[PDB]
């Protein structure tokens, strides 16, 4: 919606969002993600962490071993793109990235790190004009 999007995630492990695709002109682009459930975060919390299809597994092991206090994302991991913090149900977050951290054609995979959640809650995100 022009350099944003919204997504939300409810109490399963699902986004309502598979794909999101960045538009060419766009230099910063802005993702809120909602969390339109009503579970709490220390039981089905979740947030939003982008990275090269790649660095999943690695990024949401490291992040799981984070904690809480991190959002479940391990401090000053390089490979992570941007990330949300964890919310609870009922809450929102935002988190806007340059797009130049982005090589286009190139498909980045968004998910979540909560516990448990990596394999389940993902995506994919891609540059198009
Ligand atoms: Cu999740």
Same mark, same amino acid.
């Given at each position: 919606? *022009?350099?944003?999007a ?6 399963? !492990? ?7 695709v ?14 339109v $459930?009503?579970?709490a &975060?220390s039981? !089905? ?8 299809? %790649?660095d999943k ?6 992040? !799981?071993?984070?904690g809480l206090? *991190?959002?479940?994302?391990? %401090?000053?991991?390089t490979?992570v ?6 919310? $609870? ?10 797009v130049?951290?982005?090589? +286009? ?9 909560? +516990?448990?959640?990596?394999? !389940?809650?993902?995506?994919?995100? &891609?540059?198009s004009?």
């Amino acid at each position: 919606a *022009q350099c944003e999007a919204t997504i939300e995630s409810n109490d399963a !492990m699902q986004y309502d969002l598979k794909e999101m695709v960045v538009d060419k002109s766009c230099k910063q682009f802005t993702v809120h993600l909602k969390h339109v $459930g009503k579970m709490a &975060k220390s039981a !089905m919390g979740h947030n939003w962490v982008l990275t090269k299809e %790649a660095d999943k597994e690695g990024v949401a092991t490291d992040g !799981m071993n984070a904690g809480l206090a *991190q959002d479940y994302v391990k %401090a000053g991991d390089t490979r992570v793109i941007a990330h949300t913090k964890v919310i $609870g149900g009922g809450e929102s977050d935002s988190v806007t990235f340059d797009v130049s951290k982005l090589t +286009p054609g190139e498909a980045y995979a968004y998910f979540c790190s909560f +516990p448990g959640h990596w394999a !389940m809650h993902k995506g994919t995100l &891609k540059l198009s004009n």
